[PDB]
Amino acid sequence: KKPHRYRPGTVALREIRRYQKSTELLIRKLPF
DNA sequence: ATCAGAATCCCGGTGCCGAGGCCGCTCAATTGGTCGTAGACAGCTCTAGCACCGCTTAAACGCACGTACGCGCTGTCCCCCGCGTTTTAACCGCCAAGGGGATTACACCCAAGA
């Protein structure tokens, strides 16, 4: 059985929704 | 149409540092009184805004015809989409460099200061 693999476009929108719902700082603290 | 699959939301559960309630003053807010000038009100004016006519004309709309920018569809191969391996951004215990107590056996005698 071939392992699960999302088509190009699903995880992108998932990350869009996740980062639009949360307001945490996306840039790291020490490098900035 | 239909199922297997990893990804996502809500519920026991918990406790802790952030959110919330209380006390003493004391320095800012309040009261009362004396100056007082910038603000409210009346008056003159003429310039500036407003409405309308005479004569003029380049600007704006409808007509004629096609075309080239506008847009759907096709062939390609590409470089991101996504998973697996450590690693590089720091985080975390024993070497071989010196600073020091210790010694010069055991028992006895002589001399000379506080």
Nucleotides of B under 7 A from a protein CB: 5-8, 81-84, 90
Angle, CA of A3, A10 and A17, to the nearest 5°: 130
Q: What's the resolution in A?
A: 5.7
- Cβ A2 to strand B below 7 Å: no
Q: Is the CB of A4 under 7 A from strand B?
A: yes
Contact between the CB of A18 and strand B at under 7 Å: yes
A13 touches strand B (CB under 7 A): no
Experimental method: cryo-EM
Beta carbons of A19 and A26 less than 8 angstroms apart: yes
| Burial annotation A5-24 (CB, 10 A radius, 16+ → b, else e) | eeeeeeeeeeeeeeeeeeee
